Amino acid sequence: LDKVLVGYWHNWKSTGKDGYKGGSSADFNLSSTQEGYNVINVSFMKTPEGQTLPTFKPYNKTDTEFRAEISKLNAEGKSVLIALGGADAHIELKKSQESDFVNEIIRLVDTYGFDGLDIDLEQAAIEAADNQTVIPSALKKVKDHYRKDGKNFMITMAPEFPYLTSSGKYAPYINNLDSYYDFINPQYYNQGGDGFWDSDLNMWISQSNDEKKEDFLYGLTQRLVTGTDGFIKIPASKFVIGLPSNNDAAATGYVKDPNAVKNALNRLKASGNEIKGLMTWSVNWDAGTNSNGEKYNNTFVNTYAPMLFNNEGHHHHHH
Template sequence: MEHKPLIMGYWQNWATEGARDGYENGTSAEVDLTDVPKEYNMIVVSYMKGAGIPTFNPFNKLEEKFREQIDKLALEGRQVVLGLGGADAYIELTKGNEKYLADEIIRLVDFYGFSGICINLEQSAIDAADNQTVIPAALKSVKDYYKNEGKHFLIALAPEFPYLSLSNGKYLPYLSSLEGYYDLVCPQLYNQGGDGMWVEEMDQWLSQDNNESKEDFLYYMMDSLASGTRGYTTIPHDKLVMGLPANKDAAATGYVIDPSAVLNVMKRLKQSGNAIRGLSAWSINWDAGQDKNGQSYSYEFIKRYKDIVTPV
């Protein structure tokens, strides 16, 4: 089945003006949803979180105004999904919370017009309490609910890539529970230091933080996931999205210096029969941000890779 290529971008739902929140002391920008470049054809609003049953509120807009912005993007053919979790979010759900979580997701989807949910749990929240069973159960019931209404509810997962390995697979219970339900998996190929995989074909360990072997790391990581080899679980290639940092301020490691590496990887994957769905960027706000000297990044990521998609 042929799918429309994706460039997914995360949209930060918090104030950043003057924050110097980057790994190299740059500052991410505050961007209105309606100002996001059109080539970002899927936007992940980050995040749904909080104690108890997580929820979402826009940080700088009236709820009705935010809903209007999502409606406008929907009219352009773009999808806006809601991220669940985030690096600093501690979510802890227990057996019996399934219906409450499902009801809250349905409320948010119906009110704001979100197209789905992207699981972005990190650190201890991944396997806290009963999260690994409660969250998939809730999402399956939500997807079934909208299916009965003739609508498609998108489910995506965005794990840090080590959690897709057979030895450290904290995301594997989510994938197995959501088999037949999930639409996209967007492994984060950044902020993981020397983690990676042994590639027999090269007789070499390819680590995420080695810039000299960046193209081969990206290719063999996505190939490993598409084929279920080199110690990683299997994910259908047409559900895979390659997660990258927008620039050197967006992540400690993982920034791709030469964009031809990414474009070559996508060509190599297609030639091998494992064409992936597209790319994702952390984040739209970093793409629009500035470095420590006040120099704008000027949407470098989307300018580099926009030609992989047909703008809507």
């Protein structure tokens, strides 16, 4: 099981004081992303104002420059995905648009050197238009195109965790991409008091319960990787826990005590359900500053990279 530490990179200039607590995300080139991250998700592919197909263009670079950044990252052993969606993405794919969507994903991959695509649909997008059928169908066609080439076009997804019920809104994306997706990194953040009911403890375990953070991480993940308690099944080897980099990056979900994660990962492995790694929103936040101008100073990557990678023989690397 090759381990991943996934981080999102913002394809925009920080507006300043963009954090949930008044902090400011950092601006830096994609290729300046902190070492440690081995999957980097360019954010976002979206439908621009007054256009009708989702697309992507680097905000700060020519296509040639941006392709060179990705080639450099790839040579360094890092995978770079394009993340489809995000907030206010206006993704409304009609069945009539499928071929064009497939061709645009191929164009982006071949133009820039993306190694795959992450499905990061906002709540409104999940059931919008024909998204639920077009996105999986298109992505299967893209994957098969590159398979004929001997290449693996990676598919990942970043579902908000409450949508991951067996017959929930997300089920079609997961069910219809079975055998095609490489891993799923759900967002264990921004859902406040939501969580899950634990019948053994007779307790509701929320995503904002700091005291029981370890049991929240362990218990939600265990349900997902076994497909129990009403949750959809995602194999543990294709599962990644998504966390906020800090309290500016997300309203809720920040893990105050990294030992909660360490212990949860170890308990998963001990139960025969070792998972693939961790994800964060976001590399720009991890390098950001709080409201007082103090640097977050890459604490997320400096903490979790050694956790996943020290003494680990199976470290995901591009090619």
